[PDB]
Nucleic acid binder design. Structure first.
Ligand SMILES: O=C1c2c(ccc(O)c2O)CN1Cc1cccc(Cl)c1F
Ligand SMILES: O=C1c2c(ccc(O)c2O)CN1Cc1cccc(Cl)c1F
Ligand SMILES: [Mg+2]
Ligand SMILES: [Mg+2]
Ligand SMILES: [Mg+2]
Ligand SMILES: [Mg+2]
Ligand SMILES: [Mg+2]
Ligand SMILES: [Mg+2]
Ligand SMILES: [N+]
Ligand SMILES: [N+]
Ligand SMILES: [Zn+2]
Ligand SMILES: [Zn+2]
Lengths: 184, 368, 368, 184
DNA sequence: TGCGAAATTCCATGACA
DNA sequence: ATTGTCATGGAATTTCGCA
DNA sequence: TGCGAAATTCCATGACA
DNA sequence: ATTGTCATGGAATTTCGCA
């Protein structure tokens, strides 16, 4: 079997609802299987239509051979299947109630939720403007298993924004305090 | 005056008036019998006024002025006096065309890495498509990889919007642009400092300097035109398509598409190249680093047989940018302070400022 | 189809498929091990569809299309099929640029006599001066002698007005003009027939064809500009001055002013030449006839290393004149009916008419 | 003494009043001494101002060394003298009551009056439009004393409009009849 | 070790308005 | 303080297939 | 029958928008 | 059925003045 490559498989998923930010409520999450590169798109709903709109932006940069998802409504709709077929993208579903990715992806997806949570406290309404800075963080984060960040594996070069202070990614005393207050 | 001309009428030799000709008097004027006929020799104190009257008839250059004067006068070294006048005619100097070409163009090195240098620009106004009129074009110097964004105006605000989305992918060391209103604003300046991006500007009125992106504009317009043949010009929905189509098109001289120079492997697009199917990613990236450093790079062409290259301290003139009807095409003379490279200079300008300008927007001032 | 490809899979030799390579089967498809790697050989009945899909990705030319196909396929004489498609892509043919230059320009003989041929044209709109906005320029082909008339529009009526005054002096055999609205009107046609004047027209959108007068326009604008430096652009009162100034200016290559070529003697203007003071008029006119026939005449320059010259029956395309945004720059192919001279042709045009056009507004259709 | 040349001397004079034509009442007559070339300009009055306006057109084509006239008001005004001096043109007057030109000029001037008279009968109001055709006639008329027309002597070439039917220039029976009627 | 044909490379042209 | 570029299709050149 | 300097001719450049 | 042109100022070349 041939070695794993970028664009081999994108893993997609929704996160939300979140507090409204510039009109948006969700984040479509795309993560490249081989590299762990993350793209994030803000949407108004977990619909096929919002998914298609967003994936149309990404797929005008690069097209995956395979899309992997759970059996979310938006992904199992026959519109979404028509879309994928039109672009020669094979669709792939994990069996219901049993989500399966890859350890790398699992771990990446984990970081995404944690880093979000961390920045929506204090400014739960200002995340839309922050999605850029979040992606750069995630993609210039060092991977323990590989010698390399996703930026490095995608582009084969160092990045002009290295994130040399591998972060806390952890809730401080003042944040647990006004997150158990805001969500009460 | 009559000083020299007295001393001559008798028959003594004055330097410049050749001895073998007979210099007489007639009608109160010194004359001489030259092969072409009899000509008046005016006193030196009259000469400048004469050259000036002849030149002013139609503001003629060296020969066409001389031929007017020669009709009535002779004296030694006429053209020296004629050229002296041409060098002082404000009006000729700022209205006349140059007849010296620029020195040969530079071919700057290709950026070494993807994201070292972005070239950006606007195309438009286009026919309105969904209330959109322009396209922001962003071109990575090294790879040629291009991003397109539809906008309602070539504004700072829409530039900032689009680049916020783009730079979610990576941040570039440098962004080169021309001096469009959208790029020179202080807002844009701040937007770039906030991210440790250096703004680099073209010399003014010199789009060749953004050649990387200008050239990509041609390809974008060309493909858009073909896809729109016998349809209404609804281009908004084709941006995405044109983007992907162009990023995945081969350059015959390079033998690579911009997508390959960027990622070192094709994605799931038609006719995806499969040569590195058996390499690991790491082997692949090794091969990419190799391919990147050995791409064909062109060299400055031969100079044309009559070019000029700027010397420090030289009098040169900047081309007026948007010259009014019946107004001069050139600014007053100015001096070359520094020669940044053979095609770029700093001058002490028409007000009293320093200006960095392209040699293509200058002529050298005539007659020194 | 599988006709040839069956006969091959065993190991018999088909013309075009070189014998030294091993042609196997796999995944239901004929393949082959070529130095660059393993490529699918499609059946002939699939080939055109493939070339077409690859070409359509970004409407690429010969090499950039081939490199896409080569990624997955091999077959004999790929470029022949690629070029076949390029020759049939309506969209590429009418949108793409030419890469062949025109043949070298003709230098038509100078008219033999003053009044044999007038070249006429409008300059403008200028800044309004006394309610005037244009200048009618009339240039005698042989002498260069020029008449100027201020008008309110580039209209037939004002052309007729001015020429009635001019032709009080003499009537010209021919008047050459471009295809401006003012010159092509039937009124103007009648005005000329009434006087036994032949109207001669430039090929459309080709001002070089009125070069005699276009070039004189430059000198008129240039002098007007200089006389107007730091004054308001009140040009109306300067026409007379510019006229007389230019008619009496030397041409360095000819060594004569247009006034001299016209009258054979200067009038009472500054620096009037007096060389023929002792000749009778008749001797003078004798000398003029001599001077007229021996004036320097330039010759066609060398052809550029990649020009084309039109052959009868060739497919060529006329440049669209005022092409809309995002629309093709070329008309559909058409055929050369007659070759009037090496720089001028008659074609069977985009509707179904005969058109006489300049080779500069044509490209030869690519791929035959 | 040097031979006679074109531009050596222009002879100028007014003719009129005439019946109004497109607003005009007079003809300024300029005749080159050497060649006999005629220029005609229509004016509203025999004033210095109309003379200057007209001679400004002609003198933007060619400048005479000398202008010869009678002692008409328009020509003896000091404005007209200032004008002439500005252009280096010397002025020259015949003594009052005693007009003197040259035989050639005298004869030319004669033809001009006759040819005018001939065309103003029948259409005494339409002469303005006819001045072009009149000048071509006069300038392509053969001169008995010289072998040549004025066109020929001015330009040193034959003309595309030769006037091969040397005209009557004479009043017919029907013209003497409606000229002794119109001027009665 | 040399031929004829195909494949590849060269490069002037022109447009980014 | 900055700097031309590159798809295109004929033609020139090199390589391939075979002997 | 030759030199140094002046005069003349050559010609690439660019604009007629 | 029509078609480039020519002022310009450095540089290249020729001619002039003298011996
Ligand atoms: O693209 C632009 C552009 C212009 C003016 C102001 C801008 O801001 C632009 O972007 C002119 N222009 C076209 C153009 C003309 C000639 C040569 C090249 Cl290289 C070229 F690109
Ligand atoms: O003068 C005109 C003119 C034009 C279009 C339509 C007309 O009717 C004109 O008179 C363009 N034009 C300028 C011009 C541009 C380029 C080369 C040359 Cl030679 C030239 F003259
Ligand atoms: Mg989900
Ligand atoms: Mg721009
Ligand atoms: Mg641009
Ligand atoms: Mg015109
Ligand atoms: Mg014109
Ligand atoms: Mg009188
Ligand atoms: N460089
Ligand atoms: N000719
Ligand atoms: Zn001047
Ligand atoms: Zn095409």
């Amino acid at each position: 079997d041939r070695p794993q490559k970028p664009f081999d498989k994108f893993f997609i998923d929704y996160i939300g609802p979140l507090p409204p930010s510039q009109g948006y409520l969700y984040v479509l999450v795309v993560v490249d299987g081989m590299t762990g590169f993350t793209w994030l798109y803000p949407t108004k709903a977990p619909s096929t239509s919002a998914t298609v709109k967003s994936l149309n932006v990404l797929t005008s940069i690069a097209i995956p051979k395979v899309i992997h998802s759970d059996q979310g409504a938006a992904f199992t709709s026959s519109t979404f299947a028509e879309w994928a077929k039109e672009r020669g993208i094979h669709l792939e579903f994990s069996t219901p109630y049993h989500p399966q990715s890859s350890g790398k992806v699992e771990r990446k997806n984990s970081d995404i939720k944690r880093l979000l949570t961390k920045l929506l406290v204090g400014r739960p309404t200002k995340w839309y403007d922050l999605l850029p800075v979040v992606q750069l963080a995630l993609n210039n984060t060092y991977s323990p298993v590989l010698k390399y960040t996703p930026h490095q594996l995608l582009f084969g070069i160092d990045s002009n924004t290295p994130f040399a202070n591998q972060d806390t990614l952890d809730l401080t005393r003042e944040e647990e305090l006004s997150l158990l207050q805001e969500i009460r | 005056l009559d000083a020299e001309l007295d001393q001559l009428l008798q028959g003594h030799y004055i330097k410049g008036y050749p001895k073998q000709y007979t210099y007489f008097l007639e009608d109160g004027k010194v004359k001489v019998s030259r092969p072409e006929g009899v000509k008046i020799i005016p006193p030196q104190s009259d000469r400048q006024k004469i050259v000036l009257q002849a030149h002013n008839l139609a503001h003629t250059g060296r020969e066409a002025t001389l031929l007017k004067i020669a009709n009535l006068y002779w004296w030694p070294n006429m053209r020296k006096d004629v050229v002296k006048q041409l060098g002082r005619c404000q009006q000729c100097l700022i209205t006349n065309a140059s007849n010296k070409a620029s020195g040969p163009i530079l071919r700057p090195d290709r950026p070494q890495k993807p994201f070292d240098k972005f070239f950006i620009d606007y195309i438009g106004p286009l026919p309105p498509s969904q209330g959109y009129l322009y396209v922001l074009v962003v071109v990575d110097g090294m790879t040629g990889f291009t991003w397109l964004y539809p906008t309602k105006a070539p504004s700072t605000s829409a530039t900032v919007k689009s680049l916020n989305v783009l730079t979610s992918i990576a941040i570039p060391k440098v962004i080169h642009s021309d001096q469009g209103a959208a790029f020179t604003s202080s807002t844009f300046a701040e937007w770039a400092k906030e991210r440790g991006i250096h703004l680099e500007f073209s010399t003014p009125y010199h789009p060749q300097s953004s050649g990387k992106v200008e050239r990509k504009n041609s390809d974008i317009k060309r493909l858009l035109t073909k896809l729109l043949v016998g349809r209404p010009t609804k281009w908004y929905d084709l941006l995405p398509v044109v983007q992907l189509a162009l990023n995945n098109t081969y350059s015959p001289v390079l033998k690579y598409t911009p997508h390959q120079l960027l990622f070192g492997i094709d994605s799931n697009t038609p006719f995806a190249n499969q040569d590195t199917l058996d390499l690991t990613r790491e082997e692949e990236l090794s091969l990419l680093q190799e391919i990147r450093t050995s791409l064909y790079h062109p060299s400055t062409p031969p100079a044309s047989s009559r070019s000029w290259s700027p010397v420090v301290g030289q009098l040169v003139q900047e081309r007026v940018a948007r010259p009014a009807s019946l107004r001069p095409r050139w600014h007053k003379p100015s001096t070359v302070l520094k020669v940044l490279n053979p095609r770029t200079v700093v001058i002490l300008d028409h007000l009293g400022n320093n200006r960095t300008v392209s040699i293509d927007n200058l002529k050298p001032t005539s007659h020194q």
